[PDB]
Amino acid sequence: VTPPPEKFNFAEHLLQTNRVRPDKTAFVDDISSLSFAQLEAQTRQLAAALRAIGVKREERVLLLMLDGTDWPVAFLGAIYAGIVPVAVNTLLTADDYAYMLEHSRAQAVLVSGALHPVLKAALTKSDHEVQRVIVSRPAAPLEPGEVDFAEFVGAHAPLEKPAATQADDPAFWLYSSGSTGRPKGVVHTHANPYWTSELYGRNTLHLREDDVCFSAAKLFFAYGLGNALTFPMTVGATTLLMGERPTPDAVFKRWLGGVGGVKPTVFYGAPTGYAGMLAAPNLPSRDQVALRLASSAGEALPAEIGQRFQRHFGLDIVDGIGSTEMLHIFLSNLPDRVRYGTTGWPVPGYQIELRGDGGGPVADGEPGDLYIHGPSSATMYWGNRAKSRDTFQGGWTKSGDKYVRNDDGSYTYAGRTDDMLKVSGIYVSPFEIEATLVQHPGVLEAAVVGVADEHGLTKPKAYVVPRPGQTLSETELKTFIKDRLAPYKYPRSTVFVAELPKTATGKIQRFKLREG
Ligand SMILES: Cc1ccc(C(=O)O)cc1
Ligand SMILES: Cc1ccccc1C(=O)O
Numbered sequence: 421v422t423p424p425p426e427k428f429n430f431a432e433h434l435l436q437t438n439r440v441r442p443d444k445t446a447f448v449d450d451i452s453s454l455s456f457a458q459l460e461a462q463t464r465q466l467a468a469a470l471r472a473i474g475v476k477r478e479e480r481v482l483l484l485m486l487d488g489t490d491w492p493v494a495f496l497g498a499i500y501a502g503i504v505p506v507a508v509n510t511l512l513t514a515d516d517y518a519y520m521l522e523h524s525r526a527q528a529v530l531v532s533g534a535l536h537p538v539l540k541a542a543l544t545k546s547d548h549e550v551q552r553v554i555v556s557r558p559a560a561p562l563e564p565g566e567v568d569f570a571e572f573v574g575a576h577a578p579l580e581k582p583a584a585t586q587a588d589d590p591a592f593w594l595y596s597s598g599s600t601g602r603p604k605g606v607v608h609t610h611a612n613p614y615w616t617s618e619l620y621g622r623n624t625l626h627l628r629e630d631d632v633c634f635s636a637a638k639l640f641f642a643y644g645l646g647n648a649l650t651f652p653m654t655v656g657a658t659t660l661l662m663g664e665r666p667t668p669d670a671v672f673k674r675w676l677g678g679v680g681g682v683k684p685t686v687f688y689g690a691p692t693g694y695a696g697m698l699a700a701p702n703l704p705s706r707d708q709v710a711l712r713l714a715s716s717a718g719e720a721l722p723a724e725i726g727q728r729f730q731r732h733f734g735l736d737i738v739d740g741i742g743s744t745e746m747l748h749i750f751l752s753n754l755p756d757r758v759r760y761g762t763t764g765w766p767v768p769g770y771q772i773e774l775r776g777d778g779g780g781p782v783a784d785g786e787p788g789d790l791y792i793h794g795p796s797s798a799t800m801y802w803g804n805r806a807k808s809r810d811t812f813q814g815g816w817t818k819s820g821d822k823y824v825r826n827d828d829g830s831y832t833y834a835g836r837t838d839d840m841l842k843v844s845g846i847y848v849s850p851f852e853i854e855a856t857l858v859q860h861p862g863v864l865e866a867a868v869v870g871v872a873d874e875h876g877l878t879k880p881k882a883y884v885v886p887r888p889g890q891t892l893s894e895t896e897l898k899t900f901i902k903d904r905l906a907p908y909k910y911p912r913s914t915v916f917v918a919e920l921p922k923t924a925t926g927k928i929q930r931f932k933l934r935e936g
Pocket of ligand 1: 636637666667668669671688689690692693694696697844845
């Protein structure tokens with residue numbers, strides 16, 4: 421793969437790539453479609469609109485939007501202008517967004533109508549610098565000063581050329597959270613999505629022009645950003661977007677060609693979603709679908725899920741691991757070589773190392789901490805020098821994972837080096853869940869660990885010590901948390917206990933809880 425030139429604007433790159441196919445559909449969702457020509461026009465008018473309201477090169481804007489055709493216009497338009505979109509999870513709290521507003525110093529916000537109420541609460545509570553709120557598909561009357569996304573785009577002439585950025589200049593941020601503390605601003609460059617798109621999208625997956633891509637993973641996830649934006653635009657594939665929460669029925673409706681007159685040929689999703697589909701009574705038959713490739717990431721794929729998918733559809737599920745910091749997948753199975761129970765082999769372009777307790781080598785078959793050296797690494801966590809030093813260790817990026825290397829050069833997952841869980845393919849801190857449980861007046865103490873369900877997928881399990889003089893029932897605890905956590909964070913079970921195992925200093929021995 422040829423490096424990108426030093427003067428490189430990643431949006432311009434994707435637009436230039438598709439000037440050969442102006443009339444092919446770039447993106448389609450339940451209510452709208454953009455051809456590559458229409459996407460280019462609107463991308464460039466958005467870029468003009470953000471500049472017209474005073475947002476300067478290198479400043480940030482918050483992009484808080486459901487998956488839909490306005491999403492890539494917002495993302496690429498900011499980048500075309502040399503403005504830095506900060507693309508975020510749509511299922512966070514007002515408090516989380518308030519922090520992101522302040523931390524990013526965002527100058528504008530591009531927000532879906534459905535997300536406007538959470539955003540409003542964030543704006544009201546924070547010391548933010550937001551000059552304009554631009555609302556895609558408003559679901560309530562616009563407040564004074566706010567503007568509808570379609571009017572904002574349509575009122576500006578397209579910018580005539582892109583910001584003259586360099587390849588290593590910041591292009592966008594994603595946020596990632598660790599087991600405690602605030603979300604970290606992961607800073608990516610213009611070059612980074614070129615590398616992932618070339619090395620993984622093109623060279624590992626062999627995506628091509630006549631593909632139809634559909635990612636259950638939303639665009640704000642590193643995984644989905646590649647799967648449903650940077651990958652397909654690099655090869656001129658058409659992309660299906662869906663605003664709603666992925667469920668088996670929503671995914672199947674799309675697989676069968678229920679939206680936009682297109683049937684997906686490439687699907688991406690978490691192992692949990694694949695398990696859920698295979699358990700669904702109305703799982704489609706092979707002859708009803710056009711799938712040729714199935715990708716998974718977010719948590720390790722249990723072999724049985726992969727094998728049952730293969731038996732039903734005649735397609736393997738290609739499990740790979742990436743990270744927000746590496747932007748996309750660096751260790752993967754291949755479409756024509758899958759080894760279930762492993763995450764496959766290093767992606768060409770990426771070097772992997774397993775390090776032991778002192779940074780030393782590990783013999784094959786022994787677990788080590790996983791480090792990556794490759795060209796799509798983020799440069800830092802914005803404003804966090806200490807976290808940046810721990811993760812970005814001189815040309816090596818630490819992942820948080822442990823792996824074993826096998827005799828065939830494949831790698832098998834061996835757990836995390838922190839206390840994070842991956843649940844339904846999404847990070848969740850057990851300490852967050854603990855912090856929510858102990859605010860219930862009937863709870864004295866709580867400890868949360870990951871446990872494998874019947875499919876071998878990790879879910880939270882909570883051990884709870886009731887407060888002696890209070891009432892507390894499992895169904896009241898369920899109702900308490902329904903209210904306060906995202907559904908993927910729900911403990912799969914809660915066990916009421918009289919005490920927890922502890923060190924003589926009061927530290928909970930979580931390892932004993934995992935050992936039964
Ligand atoms: C049915 C289904 C498929 C995939 C996902 C996911 O979160 O990726 C969730 C649900
Ligand atoms: C977290 C992540 C980001 C990009 C690509 C894949 C993954 C993964 O979850 O393994």
